[PDB]
């Protein structure tokens, strides 16, 4: 059998009674082949509702204790075995079973004693009666609680980031069932940045806080908390949806959709005006992104039709979570608790929005047709056919009961979407993953991100450029060497996945959906150097972690035996000039223009020996990988040594050297050079214009800002008349006509 | 160029609290290692609190261990000294200074700073009823 | 716990006199013993690190040297502006300890 051949038997006895008590009879005979056929969150749901209308069934009772059991749910599964004990007392096996379950969870309660006793009386004195025997002496006393509970407080002292012992604190807590302690600690490190992005952590979390809901505790105590602790599950639910979709299989991911939908449903109700509210604004936009992330990973395996069909509803899902409003921040009780929602906002429009750039670009106005073809209620139903199982109830589902009002159906705005990247930077823990991703989806766009203001998020008071720059020493590290660095990963990347697909839309894919995009080896490096940056480093490991960036260092500054093809270098070269001319400030203009004219130097002798069409001696375990796709051709090398020639006259102009870098500037005849000429023409006659001096200066003074008028004019003659000058611009064609308005008044 | 900046001093009662701030610029904080040295007056230097270079494991003086909590912070580039269950003893004043990674080497059972280069004003904190 | 006992607790001297402070170790220790000068009221100044070696900047008429558990400071021509405090410091296993200090006053 398969999936077809029991959800098309779903048709079969709903064409022969289709009455609801009925259909409901026969979830035992629907189950009984969905445990056959693999499937147990769905085999789960139908056998359960044949428990709602045959509730005094031992078989079924005891169908779901043992599918309980797969679950390894064991406080779920003793109760399923307890009702088909108490209805039929002839299954010794069962009582053997609770007895066995009941003394492997917990001893502490006599329960687990009782029903020992009883499972003795029905198999005198068995090979596992015994067995159970020595399994409830095992646990500890009352010192020995305490005890491991000092070890674990001790060990999260000096290790508070390690996942595993944060997890066994909350075990130990929910061991001694002081569940508060337990959800009050998950409280507490939910703010930790590491522990929020760990999948294992926050499916603990979800655990923790469900049972505390339950438990009898969360009542007797008050019900003031009680919206506090239910804010944390939804977050949890976010974070680990994010990480089962990257990791875990189409199965799963789709399994933890019903949880978050479901926790929406029963949230939405309470509503009000504080962090809870608020929380739940900004998740529902979340679920509708993730969802759509997951339509597209569905998709990408299976064929043509419904990858568009799934594309279309994706395409929805982002724009509703786009459309959802940036949430109130201030309402919150804190600064660390505010500052993450807005975070995750951030991260929220960001990813979901290069998504609808990436799908929309496939056609024009795509976004419209979207909108105006499955705005419509009958794509809600749509929207849950293909995401769910239709049999789940449809009522207590908030993806179905969701009013989905006047949806903008407005592409998003490129400035918008940097501040947006800019903020969500600190999201995934700057994870090279992430980053690779953004600078890989502005790959594609026309405007360029800002990453040296990513940087300054994430390495706060990292210089832009090491005075020490003569050792590779790792203590030497810059904001440059960084931006360096995820240029060439990006460039690299893309180049991997553009061969990857020849073979075989790399745009399109969702953050989640994809695989590691840059080389062990870099991820490596950025792991490392991260960790050493923010401090959060092991002494023993410091020499370790210290040499192991340094072993890049003199790769990323183009030294002794650096791994990196001309083209790569090159672009590296112009990518730091433009991102340096367009700079207000000297020292930053000074910074990044001398690193670009750096790597022109260490360019120019290749092009040379590549001009006269010979071979380049290729590298040893480069760390940026080499591609002939991008090897440089004799059609280019005239322009490089031009545009080189020109960052080589912009660092002479900021030194000094004026006379060489006009008669440089001069001698080419580019735009660039215009907007250059004249801001420096500007600047030797304004400061002249206006004092008391000798008359002729004046004259001469004037001369200047003639000139500078001039040439912003050639400027625009030339921009207006054609597009490619226009994007070779160094500044944006607003900002030329900007100055020239103050300059001619002047 | 170079210089700490200590903070977050002033009187206090006895069993009270205080939160000192040690600014740093010129120097990559995170390859530091922070110190915290008390002085009272006419009295010695004192050793309070150390901050491990590039991890920052904590290591206190028997004297003030368990009641003082030394951090820092790479946001912020600051260092900060806070001081619970304040005794009429710890009256002092409180230098910080820091110790390159050049300067701090790790050792079975336990790691060792060679000098304290660079250090600050001094901020006081008495602390008396 | 070790200790690192400074002696003498109070010298007076005159300019040009070479000077010499002495600080013992009790139990067995390596050479990342420190030395300060601290002028009063003001900061404490770093003059020799890991024992013997002299820290950029400050005059050459300072030397350090060790001998068994013993450290010791030596000026070789004392002058009038190092009539201050001076601080033995040991750093041993998550640990640093200071000497009781040694003031050097003028003597007349």
């Known amino acids: 059998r398969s999936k077809a051949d029991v959800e098309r038997y779903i048709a079969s006895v709903q064409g022969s009674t289709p009455s609801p008590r009925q259909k409901s009879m026969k979830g035992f005979y629907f189950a009984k082949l969905y445990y056959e056929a693999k499937e147990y969150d769905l085999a789960k749901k139908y056998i359960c509702t044949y428990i709602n209308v045959q509730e005094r069934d031992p078989k079924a009772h005891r169908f779901l204790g043992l599918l309980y059991e797969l679950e390894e749910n064991t406080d779920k599964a003793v109760e399923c075995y307890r009702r088909s004990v108490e209805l039929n007392p002839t299954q010794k096996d069962l009582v053997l079973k609770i007895a066995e379950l009941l003394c492997k969870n917990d001893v502490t309660d006599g329960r687990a004693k009782y029903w020992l006793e009883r499972a003795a009386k029905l198999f005198p004195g068995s090979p596992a009666i015994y067995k159970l025997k020595e399994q409830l002496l095992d646990c500890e006393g009352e010192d020995g609680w305490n005890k491991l509970f000092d070890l674990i407080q001790s060990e999260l002292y000096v290790r508070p980031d390690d996942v595993h012992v944060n997890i066994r604190l909350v075990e130990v807590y929910r061991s001694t069932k002081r569940l508060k302690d337990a959800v009050a600690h998950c409280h507490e490190a939910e703010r930790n940045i590491a522990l929020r992005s760990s999948l294992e952590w926050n499916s603990c979390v979800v655990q923790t806080l469900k049972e505390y809901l339950e438990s009898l505790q969360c009542l007797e105590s008050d019900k003031s908390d009680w919206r506090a602790t239910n804010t944390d599950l939804l977050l949890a639910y976010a974070n680990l949806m994010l990480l089962t979709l990257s990791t875990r299989d189409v199965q799963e991911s789709r399994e933890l959709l019903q949880s978050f939908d479901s926790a929406l449903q029963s949230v939405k109700s309470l509503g009000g005006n504080d962090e809870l509210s608020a929380t739940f604004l900004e998740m529902k936009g979340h679920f509708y992104m993730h969802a759509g992330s997951l339509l597209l990973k569905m998709g990408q395996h299976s064929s043509n039709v419904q990858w568009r069909a799934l594309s279309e509803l994706a395409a929805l899902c982002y724009l509703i979570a786009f459309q959802v409003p940036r949430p109130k921040i201030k309402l919150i009780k804190g600064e660390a608790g505010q500052n993450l929602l807005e975070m995750m906002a951030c991260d929220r429009l960001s990813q979901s929005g290069h998504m609808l750039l990436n799908l929309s670009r496939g056609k024009q106005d795509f976004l419209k047709e979207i909108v105006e073809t499955f705005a419509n209620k009958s794509g809600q139903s749509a929207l849950y056919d293909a995401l769910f199982s239709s049999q789940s109830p449809k009522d207590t589902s908030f993806l179905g009961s969701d009013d989905i009002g006047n949806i903008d159906v407005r592409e998003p705005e490129l400035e918008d979407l940097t501040r947006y990247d800019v903020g969500a930077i600190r999201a995934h823990n700057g994870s090279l993953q992430h980053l690779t991703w953004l600078g890989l989806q502005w790959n594609s766009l026309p405007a360029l991100p800002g990453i040296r203001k990513w940087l300054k998020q994430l390495f706060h008071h990292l210089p832009h450029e090491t005075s020490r720059l003569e050792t590779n020493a790792p203590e030497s590290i810059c904001i440059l060497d960084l931006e360096v660095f995820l240029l060439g990963v990006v460039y690299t990347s893309h180049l991997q996945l553009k061969e990857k697909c020849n073979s075989h839309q790399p745009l399109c894919l969702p953050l989640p959906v994809c695989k590691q995009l840059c080389t062990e080896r870099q991820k490596s490096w950025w792991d490392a150097v991260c960790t050493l940056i923010h401090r959060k480093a092991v002494p023993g490991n410091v020499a370790k972690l210290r040499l192991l960036v340094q072993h890049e260092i003199n790769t990323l500054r183009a030294q002794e035996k650096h791994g990196l093809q001309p083209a790569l270098l090159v672009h590296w070269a112009e990518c730091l000039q433009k991102t340096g001319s367009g700079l207000n400030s000297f020292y930053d203009q000074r910074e990044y223009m001398g690193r670009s004219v750096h790597y022109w130097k260490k360019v120019l002798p290749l092009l040379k020996i590549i001009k006269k069409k010979n071979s380049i001696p290729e590298p040893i375990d480069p760390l940026f990988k080499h591609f002939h796709s991008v090897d440089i051709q004799a059609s280019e090398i005239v322009e490089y040594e031009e545009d080189a020639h020109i960052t080589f006259a912009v660092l002479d102009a900021v030194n000094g050297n004026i006379e060489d870098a006009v008669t440089a500037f001069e001698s080419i005849k580019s735009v660039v050079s215009y907007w250059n000429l004249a801001l420096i023409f500007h600047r030797k006659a304004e400061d002249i214009e206006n004092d008391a001096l000798s008359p002729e200066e004046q004259e001469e003074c004037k001369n200047y800002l003639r000139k500078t008028r001039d040439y912003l004019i050639k400027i625009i003659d030339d921009s207006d008349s054609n597009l490619s000058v226009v994007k070779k611009l160094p500044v944006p064609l607003e900002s030329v006509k900007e100055m020239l308005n103050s300059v001619m008044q002047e | 160029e170079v210089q700490l900046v200590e903070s977050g001093g002033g009187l206090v009662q006895p069993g009270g609290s205080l939160r000192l701030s040690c600014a740093a610029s010129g120097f990559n904080f995170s390859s530091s290692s922070i110190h915290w040295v008390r002085q009272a007056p006419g009295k010695g230097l004192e050793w309070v609190a150390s901050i491990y270079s590039y991890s920052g494991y904590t290591s206190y003086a028997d004297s003030v261990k368990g009641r003082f909590t030394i951090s820092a912070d790479t946001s912020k580039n600051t260092a900060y000294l806070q001081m619970n269950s304040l005794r009429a003893e710890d009256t002092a004043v409180y230098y910080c200074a820091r110790s390159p990674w050049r300067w701090s080497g790790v050792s079975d059972g336990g790691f060792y700073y060679k000098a304290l280069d660079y250090w600050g004003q001094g901020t006081l904190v008495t602390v008396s009823s | 716990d070790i200790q690192m006992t400074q002696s003498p607790s109070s010298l007076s001297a005159s300019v040009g006199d070479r000077v010499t402070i002495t600080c013992r170790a009790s139990?067995?220790?390596?050479?990342?013993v420190a030395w300060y000068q601290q002028k009063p009221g003001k900061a404490p100044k770093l003059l020799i690190y890991?024992?013997?070696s002299l820290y950029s900047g400050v005059p050459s008429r300072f030397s350090g040297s060790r001998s068994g558990t013993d450290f010791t400071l030596t000026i070789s021509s004392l002058q009038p502006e190092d009539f201050a405090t001076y601080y033995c410091q040991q750093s041993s296993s998550s640990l640093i300890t200071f000497g009781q200090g040694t003031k050097v006053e003028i003597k007349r």
């Open positions: 890991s024992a013997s």
């Open positions: 139990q067995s220790v390596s050479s990342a």
